Amino acid sequence: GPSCVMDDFRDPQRWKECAKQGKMPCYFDLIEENVYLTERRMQCECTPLSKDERAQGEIACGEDCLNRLLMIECSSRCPNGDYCSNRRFQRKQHADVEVILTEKKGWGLRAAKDLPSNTFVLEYCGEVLDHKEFKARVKEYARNKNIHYYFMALKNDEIIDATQKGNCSRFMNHSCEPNCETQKWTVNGQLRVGFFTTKLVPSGSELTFDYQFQRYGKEAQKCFCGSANCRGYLGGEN
Ligand SMILES: CC(=O)N1CCN([C@@H]2CCC[C@@H](NC(=O)c3cc4c(F)ccc(C)c4[nH]3)C2)CC1
Ligand SMILES: C[S@@+](CC[C@H](N)C(=O)[O-])C[C@H]1O[C@@H](n2cnc3c(N)ncnc32)[C@H](O)[C@@H]1O
Ligand SMILES: [Zn+2]
Ligand SMILES: [Zn+2]
Ligand SMILES: [Zn+2]
């Protein structure tokens, strides 16, 4: 299969014509941050790491950071300042991942390196919709006869749509037996969704998560994850 690194998405011209030669997926607007179609705090208690503790390689805002435990990211005002390891989303500290053609699912994501268990992969970025905007879009995509859908539930009246605008996170595929999960994190009072490994993911391996978004309409998409325990279709029951 053809592959490409995440830096290949930064050059729209070379991208567009790579796409014409089918060596890259179709063009979409690349964004670093969620874009609201309609516009709508305090620090952790981690004891600053001494320069020596930092040298030894001790982790700043690690497993015991009060902010991390609550899936809240520290700000510029964290007592560990620049050394805070709990600003992954804001600092784009994404895993090393490539975009690959799969036999039947379209494009996908794979580890370029071994990925430890419980590792941040990518934020799922896109246009944030309310229910009304969501229902407009479902109808628009249905009428265009789109195959690939990019909806991700954020919360009540907030659905992320990475159809037109998003990042490489939009290439991660469903599996019934996944190696990743979603986590909803608080970043500057705003909620965001990121992919995280659930196990050690060998280099070259396809990255996958259990997509549980509630099915609408009559005909559901067939699942080609190939797990022995495949549910056979994409989306949650209803
Ligand atoms: C053709 C047609 O009209 N259909 C009716 C609508 N259904 C689904 C229902 C559930 C919402 C929507 N799926 C996604 O947005 C979606 C899938 C998916 C995935 F499999 C992996 C990862 C991500 C981020 C994913 N998002 C449309 C598809 C069939
Ligand atoms: C968010 S997109 C994932 C990226 C997509 N493969 C692409 O090339 O743009 C989700 C879509 O990918 C396909 N897909 C994802 N997981 C799949 C699976 N397990 N089996 C079959 N198709 C899958 C479906 O068309 C689905 O609507
Ligand atoms: Zn902390
Ligand atoms: Zn911190
Ligand atoms: Zn499956």
Side-chain angles (χ1 to χ4, degrees):
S3 83
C4 48
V5 284
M6 273 158 59
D7 279 3
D8 294 327
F9 295 86
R10 305 190 102 139
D11 184 345
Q13 274 268 66
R14 196 199 87 113
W15 180 5
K16 273 174 190 184
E17 80 193 342
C18 279
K20 279 175 208 152
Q21 297 168 26
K23 264 146 204 138
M24 289 187 71
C26 298
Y27 181 76
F28 64 85
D29 287 358
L30 181 76
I31 61 175
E32 306 298 284
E33 210 161 304
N34 287 337
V35 193
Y36 283 74
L37 224 73
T38 288
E39 250 197 329
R40 324 263 164 140
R41 259 194 204 163
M42 207 48 114
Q43 278 77 78
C44 61
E45 283 174 355
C46 301
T47 297
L49 283 198
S50 75
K51 265 160 185 175
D52 260 338
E53 280 163 13
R54 165 199 89 190
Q56 288 185 341
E58 289 293 278
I59 305 307
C61 290
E63 53 157 352
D64 289 332
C65 177
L66 287 179
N67 277 340
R68 183 187 291 274
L69 291 164
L70 296 168
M71 297 169 77
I72 304 174
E73 283 214 338
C74 299
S75 75
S76 46
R77 294 157 157 290
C78 167
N80 284 312
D82 300 306
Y83 288 106
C84 183
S85 66
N86 188 28
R87 309 198 64 204
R88 290 176 295 177
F89 272 79
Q90 298 166 81
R91 287 206 182 286
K92 308 306 273 182
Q93 301 181 318
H94 67 61
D96 185 6
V97 303
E98 302 169 347
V99 186
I100 53 158
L101 190 59
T102 74
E103 190 57 25
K104 333 190 215 189
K105 303 177 294 191
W107 292 88
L109 287 186
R110 67 165 179 202
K113 297 171 156 151
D114 286 44
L115 303 182
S117 189
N118 309 123
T119 301
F120 176 61
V121 176
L122 273 165
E123 174 179 340
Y124 197 93
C125 289
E127 297 180 278
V128 180
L129 314 182
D130 62 24
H131 282 326
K132 195 188 182 301
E133 284 160 338
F134 168 64
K135 261 148 193 207
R137 288 285 181 97
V138 297
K139 180 159 266 79
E140 176 176 326
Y141 300 150
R143 189 171 300 255
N144 296 337
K145 304 183 185 294
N146 292 354
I147 295 165
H148 297 309
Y149 281 75
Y150 301 93
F151 296 130
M152 184 73 66
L154 185 56
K155 65 169 179 198
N156 278 14
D157 211 58
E158 275 193 34
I159 307 298
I160 301 162
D161 175 0
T163 316
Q164 305 167 247
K165 305 179 183 187
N167 67 19
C168 292
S169 70
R170 79 199 287 280
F171 296 117
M172 190 179 295
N173 284 316
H174 166 78
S175 163
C176 300
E177 194 169 317
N179 53 14
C180 293
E181 73 183 355
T182 60
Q183 285 185 42
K184 290 171 190 151
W185 281 71
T186 292
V187 174
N188 283 289
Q190 281 325 291
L191 199 54
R192 301 185 184 198
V193 165
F195 294 127
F196 296 74
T197 66
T198 48
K199 69 178 90 169
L200 200 180
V201 171
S203 173
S205 282
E206 185 175 14
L207 293 164
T208 65
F209 76 106
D210 195 359
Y211 186 67
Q212 286 288 124
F213 192 107
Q214 303 195 330
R215 282 194 280 271
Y216 70 77
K218 289 189 173 59
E219 182 144 315
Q221 287 187 288
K222 301 213 168 207
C223 175
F224 300 128
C225 78
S227 165
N229 314 128
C230 189
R231 304 194 296 272
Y233 304 93
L234 301 181
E237 196 203 348
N238 282 307

